[PDB]
Amino acid sequence: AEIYNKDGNKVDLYGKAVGLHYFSKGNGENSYGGNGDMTYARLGFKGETQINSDLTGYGQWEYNFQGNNSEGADAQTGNKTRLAFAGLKYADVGSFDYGRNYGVVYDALPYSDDFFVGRVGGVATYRNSNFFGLVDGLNFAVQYLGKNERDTARRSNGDGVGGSISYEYEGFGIVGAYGAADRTNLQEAQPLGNGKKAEQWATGLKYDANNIYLAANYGETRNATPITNKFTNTSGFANKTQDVLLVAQYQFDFGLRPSIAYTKSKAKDVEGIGDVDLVNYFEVGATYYFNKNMSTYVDYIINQIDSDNKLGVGSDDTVAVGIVYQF
Amino acid sequence: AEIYNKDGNKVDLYGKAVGLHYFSKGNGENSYGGNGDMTYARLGFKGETQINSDLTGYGQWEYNFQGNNSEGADAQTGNKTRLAFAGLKYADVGSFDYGRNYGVVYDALPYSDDFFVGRVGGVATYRNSNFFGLVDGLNFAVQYLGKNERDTARRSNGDGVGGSISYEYEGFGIVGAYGAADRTNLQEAQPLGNGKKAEQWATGLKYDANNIYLAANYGETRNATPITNKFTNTSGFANKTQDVLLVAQYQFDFGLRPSIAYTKSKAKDVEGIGDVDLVNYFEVGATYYFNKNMSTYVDYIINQIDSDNKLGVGSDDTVAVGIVYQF
Amino acid sequence: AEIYNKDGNKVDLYGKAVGLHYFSKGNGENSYGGNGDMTYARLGFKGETQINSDLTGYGQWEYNFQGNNSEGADAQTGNKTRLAFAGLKYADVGSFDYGRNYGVVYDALPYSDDFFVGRVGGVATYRNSNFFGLVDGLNFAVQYLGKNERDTARRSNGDGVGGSISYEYEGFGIVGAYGAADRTNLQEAQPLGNGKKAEQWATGLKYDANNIYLAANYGETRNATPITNKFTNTSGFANKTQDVLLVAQYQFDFGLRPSIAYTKSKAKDVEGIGDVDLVNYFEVGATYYFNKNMSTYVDYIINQIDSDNKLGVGSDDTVAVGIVYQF
């Protein structure tokens, strides 16, 4: 909500309280999403100041407060800052910002701290829209990722670059995104995956108009995707994955947006196992929007993964019912 | 404070900074409230959106930031989300919400993560006011508590239900609240307390009008109340407790609200000890309200617990002086 | 930003998103500021309510959310409440507040949880301006510090008092600040430093007017300053330090504020080493203010510490580039 706006600066204090429960058989150890209370909330701010007609400053922070912990020792589990960055936008030259932000590969997609696919720290991002204002519909972004040596291999990263180009024409959109980066000493000391460099690229198509939203991506990865062998308690990254994502949605005027999606991600050459599906499921769900501030929804994960998945990846279904308020 | 209100949605960003110190002899190990700086702050939001004339959406989050930690490793100690839930209210049919919220037994009372007495995660709560609008003054609430297997027995819980009925007539109010729930494998592996089910019920009376506020509850519990044997460093729950709470207050027009309260809680059949007082004290205090945003107060705990309390419960007094700002 | 102001109470919700990176050679283990992403954000509130013409209530909370952690286990590292206190201000009698706040020695200075130099918990602070309104330009503050026995010597403290007097006349300002406090059992069990009392005093001069800002402090300490012997992995406090701080700045009308500063802090009688520089560096930097909400800057630390610093204090340079948004 725009809580402030005077003298050219406007702040937006936003957030939401989400009542959310997951239903999966057993102890949700072997299911898709786990089982139980998954209630949580979000708080964040988006500032933007008009330095002058062409120049704009801006920043944004976003936190995630879990709502299913005891007020005990485990009180903090799951909490974290998702975003934190300040930047400038100048006329038609483009924009630049640095901080914790989204990797450029995510730029095309209808994991966190996973190189260029989700949110990561230390990224300087440049973005240009309409090709310096010369080509309506042509945008691009390049990104520099500062090395991040964490106490954990899954959480670390070496220096890298990435970029993405996308062209949008009348509800239509096409996107290409690629990234490469070094792997830390620790990432390399890991038991699964082999290489001193990690890459992630994905392309995408989308039709976004007329209450309709279809989208289809295809991409791959090298030593970027995190995988764990539940049997051996072994971890590392997949040598190679091939990922497919499909999404079809339709928004009814009353507030019903039914969704159908399919996702498959399969590892290749996994040291010891060979080929293994990491993710495989359909997803049926419906969201109902009372208005812009309130909504409820039931997602249904029809897990396709079988019980003899070498990695030990779960094969059970999960049903997610949630009620959402937001400002 | 109502920071937002446009297009039928209004947000209330609230909170407070509390300068608070506790005075108790020794190292406050053996006193009632501990000794020292107990300064802390609170931040939270309450949203509410009018989906239409009869339908209302709403959500609320509340955090607790301790103000007495170093900016060091212990920086986070005590912090936690107290509340997090979204719900809907429809005409006279009642309301429903899910998330971290208050147990229904608390519904009658002028511990957290303790079944139905304080705040707990994963509760779906239904509440009806004025009996579908047919009986002014008659309300009720039923509550479903999702199992919560935590790493800690004191923090865990099995499935359960609870409900409460209350009737309020002209400053008068009567309340009945009951709850029962399963106990987790871990809760049962505990050394104190025996049963595979936990119950908590309490009833209450109150006179709330004319600058006066009297109130008196009485209740009991089975394997619900957490107790620790400071000697044996043993923990578990009390087999049976009988709890009494008394409160008398009077608000002077200038801003002085003097208070007198008495609280006694006594365990029964404690494996090994027999009967033992868990809590026993009078409480004299006075709050002074400068206005709705500022206030100060001195509470005085006249601990009745004696020095030969088998559990090792503290017997010292405590004086609490605090200054409060709030928006 | 003043988000609220009705019925005599006004809240200011403030904060900022800071993109910030540090450039230092090697693994920044031996440099001045460390190396890498140092992005972070801040959120805080300052309330103030007019109880009546002369009486004012107020409170303030301030948190620090790191923006360079993974959303993993290390998610919380660095986060903490910096401030948390409520107080009252009465006519010309002065003001009093209690909570986590700034030590009075900091009162003169153009470490946290370090007695009276930075922020500390449990301080009751009294402040008088213009000598009960009788002497324009004469202010003073006395401060009581509640004992703070933490699990860590560096983070603990015994009872103490401190005070400061300062006189400001037309861009000119002079300041004296002194403090003394007991040292905890643990602080005394430490291998470096000897005494059962800690003192910190510093004096200061400043010229603040005409786009100019010069300032110069001088002070000392006894068993107050924390020091670590990187070789022996020994820690404790310095027996004696002599600290000098110098700052010259000039604000150009366009938004350029170039700065020059020098800081030297040298320990004395360090058990085993003798005299050792703790801090020694010049600092060249320039801040550029687009407006009151946006800014960018490059600081350059010209570390003077040599490579043969007995404590093992770093000798490398560091360059800090940061972009700031704030409301």
UniProtKB/Swiss-Prot annotation, chains A, B, C:
Its main location: membrane. Residues 7, 52-53, 92-93, 129-136, 170, 210, 253-254, 291-292 are periplasmic. The keyword Transmembrane applies. Pfam families: Porin_1 (PF00267). CDD domains: gram_neg_porins. InterPro entries: Gram-neg_bact_OMP, Gram_neg_porin_domain, Porin_dom_sf, Porin_gammaproteobac, Porin_Gram-ve, Porin_Gram-ve_CS. It is found in: Cell outer membrane. One of its GO terms (molecular function) is lipid binding. The chain crosses the membrane at residues 1-6, 8-23, 39-51, 54-66, 83-91, 94-100, 122-128, 137-146, 159-169, 171-182, 198-209, 211-222, 240-252, 255-268, 279-290, 293-302, 318-327. It is a multi-pass membrane protein. Homotrimer. Forms mixed heterotrimers with OmpC and with PhoE; other mixed heterotrimers are also probable. NCBIfam families: PRK10002.1 (NF007446). This is Outer membrane porin F.
